[PDB]
Amino acid sequence: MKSADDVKKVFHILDKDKSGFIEEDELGSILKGFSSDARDLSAKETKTLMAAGDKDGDGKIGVEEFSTLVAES
Ligand SMILES: [Ca+2]
Ligand SMILES: [Ca+2]
Structure with a gap:
């Protein structure tokens, strides 16, 4: 299980336009x-x-x- 902070770090890396969401062009x-x-x-x-x-x-x-x-299965 990854920590919440680690998960948020990756989310921020993917959210290139800082919109707060990953749109299709970022996924x-x-x-x-x-x-x-x-x-x-x-x-x-x-x-x-x-x-x-x-x-x-x-x-x-x-x-x-x-x-x-990304939750652990
Ligand atoms: Ca975005
Ligand atoms: Ca949604």
């Missing part, structure tokens, strides 16, 4: 937020991930939804 870099040597997601993978992760349906991923995505 493809998600694996890179954790390890710079990770691959980019394809456009199709990004759209799929956005749909799966956007639990409240507002079209973007906020901090709680992002935390849920």
Whole structure:
């Protein structure tokens, strides 16, 4: 389990425009937020991930939804 501070650090790295949410144009870099040597997601993978992760349906991923995505299974 990653700490809340660690999770927020990655969220901030992904939120390039500081909007407070990860929009579609920022989500493809998600694996890179954790390890710079990770691959980019394809456009199709990004759209799929956005749909799966956007639990409240507002079209973007906020901090709680992002935390849920990375919660330890
Ligand atoms: Ca953003
Ligand atoms: Ca959302």
